[PDB]
Design an enzyme around this catalytic site. Structure first.
Site, PDB file in Angstrom:
ATOM      1  N   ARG A  80      18.506 -35.376   9.975  1.00  0.00           N
ATOM      2  CA  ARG A  80      19.131 -34.787   8.190  1.00  0.00           C
ATOM      3  C   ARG A  80      17.485 -34.581   8.207  1.00  0.00           C
ATOM      4  NH1 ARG A  80      23.616 -36.634   7.293  1.00  0.00           N
ATOM      5  NH2 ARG A  80      24.656 -38.058   9.073  1.00  0.00           N
ATOM      6  N   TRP A  85      27.300 -46.003   4.448  1.00  0.00           N
ATOM      7  CA  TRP A  85      26.502 -44.825   2.950  1.00  0.00           C
ATOM      8  C   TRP A  85      26.814 -45.105   1.898  1.00  0.00           C
ATOM      9  CZ3 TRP A  85      25.366 -38.882   3.850  1.00  0.00           C
ATOM     10  CH2 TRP A  85      24.906 -38.973   5.531  1.00  0.00           C
ATOM     11  N   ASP A 106      19.931 -38.649  13.686  1.00  0.00           N
ATOM     12  CA  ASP A 106      20.598 -39.157  12.434  1.00  0.00           C
ATOM     13  C   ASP A 106      19.803 -38.998  12.232  1.00  0.00           C
ATOM     14  OD1 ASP A 106      22.123 -42.019  12.367  1.00  0.00           O
ATOM     15  OD2 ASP A 106      20.650 -43.134  10.924  1.00  0.00           O
ATOM     16  N   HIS A 112      26.915 -42.682  19.142  1.00  0.00           N
ATOM     17  CA  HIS A 112      26.477 -42.004  18.673  1.00  0.00           C
ATOM     18  C   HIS A 112      24.775 -41.917  19.029  1.00  0.00           C
ATOM     19  CE1 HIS A 112      24.760 -40.998  14.245  1.00  0.00           C
ATOM     20  NE2 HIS A 112      23.758 -41.699  14.774  1.00  0.00           N
ATOM     21  N   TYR A 124      19.061 -44.230   2.124  1.00  0.00           N
ATOM     22  CA  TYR A 124      20.302 -43.740   2.018  1.00  0.00           C
ATOM     23  C   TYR A 124      20.469 -43.813   0.734  1.00  0.00           C
ATOM     24  CZ  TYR A 124      22.152 -45.393   6.407  1.00  0.00           C
ATOM     25  OH  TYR A 124      22.112 -45.207   7.432  1.00  0.00           O
TER      26      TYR A 124
END
Lengths: 297, 297
Positions: free
Chosen positions: B111, B153, B107, B277, B216
């Site tokens: 990144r 998002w 997750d 996920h 975010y």
């Protein structure tokens, strides 16, 4: 408590088969229906309705489920809050007044009812004005990073219940005020009448009203989009003369040149930018009223 | 809060941007594991024991997350950009003498991981990313279907304090809704309840929630910009990479993950895992086996 912002206007509870529609009614002459959007109520027209009521019978209605209109029970498809269903309910409301052929101006959610009405039952309208929207289909088809951030509430409020309802319940007064302020040119609440803001805040304070708004946006992500998609694929156009107004700093100008967009959807459309954010009748009441008076006359 | 890593040590690693908390266990080549949202390092508690049989496993809380310090953010959300987080975790690892290490991320942590591999490829022996595509790819695929799927998002990237104020009314609801909604079963049954308590407790802190929004926000802006520069320059990750995703996870909802990762990585292999996920909790054995096999080759 709640200020009467339409001095001289009657107040009508119009019965329909889906529940009552609340309306302020003023003036005389041809019927003109004014439909508000999110997160507002009919009182958003309070600075432009008296100008219109010099020439028209102005009906300033709360959308189904908004403000003081009754809230019909929704379903898995959010049917009563689809713009097709709201348009049918408002057509029935106008019939109760003997208005089967009327002028229509809508803003935000009300403008979505209004162009859907024009696509489904164009015979009901003499002329149509939409304020600071593009068709729902256009927003979803234009969905990109930029637009996802700008109209995030389109996907946020369409999440399955009770997710947005619970989050909105975390600070409803802040959210309704943040939505009002962020979408103006000024970026604060100084363009609004504080007594109108109180109407919006009190309506947003009701958890049932907030659920209706989420049902509205849920319809906007699903059934409303599909109804629009059928008209695009069938090449259906609005044959009613229409005026598209938008704010120079509003919501519809960032997606695409709104007049160019609306020509694909309407055969007879004129358009003009208004030096305003999203809330044209409150940020720019004289310009908005003048354009509406000129067009509907 | 339960200790979910029996036998693992605890380390508070000073860096220039604040302390990194990590559980440290095992022996052998160094392997850094990075969690994401809305979790902490304890998401690895089912797989890290298996990894610790072969590797020195460093299970770190992301900067700003869990028990790591929270650098104050700024207008560009700099400390919570993946570029900054990567540099801070490189610093953290240097403090332990690990200047070349293996890295597996999930997750948000994934990144950080692929941004680390783009910026400083010489720090990594091998790289594994779990259930992500690059941030650029999610934004580039943000159509109606995907904006509804990963609404958060664009919701969490709204300017402060909007998401913060809405999250603060009932934090428990949102963290449990996010955990539940992204699993295969759609509930909390895949998670150890002791792990859930770690996640819920982290999420109950308003400063921790602010950091997640800053994460975010960075994801919607600077992270996207950094990714965009690399794709348009054709910069590919040269480090041997493993891409694992859930058959019913987030990455597969936007595109076929391996095809996308082959655009970003010159040496990438990939496998789906029957899971939502949260691969290391929903499918610990399958996840642990894929990582052990990839990192020991």
């Amino acid at each position: 408590d709640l200020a009467d912002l339409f001095p001289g206007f009657g107040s009508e509870w119009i019965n329909t088969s889906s529940g009552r529609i609340f309306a302020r009614v003023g003036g005389d002459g041809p019927p003109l229906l004014l439909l508000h959007g999110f997160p507002q109520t009919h009182v958003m027209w309070h600075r432009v309705a008296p100008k219109l009521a010099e020439r028209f019978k102005v009906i300033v209605a709360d959308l189904p489920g908004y403000g003081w209109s009754d809230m019909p029970e929704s379903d898995e498809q959010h049917t009563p809050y689809t713009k097709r269903a709201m348009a049918k309910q408002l057509i029935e409301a106008m019939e109760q007044l003997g208005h089967v052929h009327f002028a229509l101006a809508g803003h935000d959610r009300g403008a979505r009812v209004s162009y859907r009405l024009a696509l489904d039952s164009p015979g009901r309208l003499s002329k149509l004005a939409v304020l600071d929207i593009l068709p729902t289909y256009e927003y979803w088809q234009r969905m990109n990073r930029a637009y996802a951030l700008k109209i995030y509430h389109w996907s946020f409020l369409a999440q399955p219940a009770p997710l947005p309802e619970n989050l909105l319940g975390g600070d409803p007064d802040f959210y309704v005020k943040a939505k009002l302020a962020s979408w103006t040119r000024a970026g604060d609440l100084s363009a609004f009448d504080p007594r109108a803001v109180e109407h919006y805040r009190i309506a947003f304070a009701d958890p049932m009203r907030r659920h209706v708004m989420c049902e509205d946006y849920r319809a906007g992500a699903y059934a409303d989009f599909e109804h629009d998609k059928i008209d695009v694929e069938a090449g259906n156009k609005i044959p009613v003369p229409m005026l598209a107004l938008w704010g120079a700093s509003g919501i519809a100008q960032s997606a695409a040149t709104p007049l160019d967009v609306w020509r694909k959807w309407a055969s007879d459309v004129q358009g003009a930018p208004i030096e305003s954010g999203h809330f044209l009748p409150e940020e720019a009441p004289d310009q908005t009223a003048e354009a509406l008076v000129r067009f509907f006359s």
